[model samples]
Target: ANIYKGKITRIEPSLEAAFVDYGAERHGFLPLKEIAREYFPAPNIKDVLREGQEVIVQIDKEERGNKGAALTTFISLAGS
Candidate 1:
């Protein structure tokens, strides 16, 4: 029931995850798997997305222990 817009703070290709500066105490986790479905197989994240890029993300899942909120670009406010 929440949506967040933030700029990417960092990218860790090693961990296959990226951090977003969503004005929280810590950066939120935007896992590669959670990114748009189009980016897969070949297009490197570094090539597709750069640090400081702004994004519109929906809170797909709550944060787990030691992890920030999980986010997704696939928005569906009406749950369609």
Candidate 2:
């Protein structure tokens, strides 16, 4: 999996997901459940995230057809 720093472009409450611009042709898909609680204690997507918010994410799945890459905030970090 690859990590990326992206910006939140849009929020979809119905889908409980967000679209992120990770320097790709199409935006990536970030599900609400994938969001880390440390970012926001609130459970709602709208409450935790907003438009133009920058976030660090890892690719959960590659882009397919018209769909963009899938993303998650539960990242693994290696410290030296």
Candidate 3:
């Protein structure tokens, strides 16, 4: 399986997406669908994941339009 790692910076409920600071020229989009059950952000949307939260995600899809690259946080790397 493929693997990816990045830091969560932003979230998009409308698109069911999030931004992960992957140290690339640009951040990435963490898609809600690709996100595994255990890896899904909790508590609430806005209060779910804070900015700069480092996460080990997996690449789900490539860049699409203004949207960033899709991602998934599973096959977990760590926990609080």
Candidate 4:
């Protein structure tokens, strides 16, 4: 797996998804699908993350504009 590593610059919320920074030129995109399963019931990024926080994530796919890293959680390697 081509695992990516970086620090979270910030987290932006949307009605359907969340945006995260993977210390890349572009930020990462995290859809509800990538969100934690335990948070599924009340799945909300605001419920778990904050700005200027650090997180470990995976390189699930190519990123969007200003979105190079879409970090995720599921048996994560660091930061429970």
Model 1 stretches astray by more than 4 angstroms: 37-42
The numbered model that scores best in TM-score is 2
Question: Please, what is the whole-model Cα lDDT of each candidate in the order they appear?
Answer: 0.75, 0.89, 0.67, 0.58
lDDT of 2 at 54: 88
Give per-model TM-scores. 0.78, 0.87, 0.62, 0.55
Model 1, 13-72: lDDT tens digits are: 887778888777768888777787654435556665678887778777677788888877
> Comparing 3 and 4 by lDDT, which wins?
3
lDDT of 3 at 29: 78
- Name the runs in model 2 displaced over 4 angstroms: 78-80
Q: Model 4, range 1-80, lDDT digits (tens) per residue?
A: 64554454555566445556655667776655675655443345666655565555676767665546555754345564
Rank by TM-score, descending? 2, 1, 3, 4
Q: How far is candidate 4 from the true structure (C-alpha RMSD, Å)?
A: 5.3
Per-residue lDDT of candidate 3, residues 1-80 (tens digit): 55666887887677666689775656787766555566545334444565776677766677777766666775545673
Those runs of model 3 whose alpha carbons end farther than 4 Å from true positions after fitting are: 13-16, 37-43, 75-80
The sequence of per-residue lDDT tens digits that candidate 2 reaches over residues 1-80 is 48888999999988989999989988999999888877785367888899998889998889998899999999877882
Q: Ten-residue segment with the worst summed lDDT in candidate 4?
A: 35-44
TM-score of 1: 0.78
Superposed by TM-score, candidate 3 places the C-alpha of residue 26 at a distance from the truth, in angstroms, of 2.8
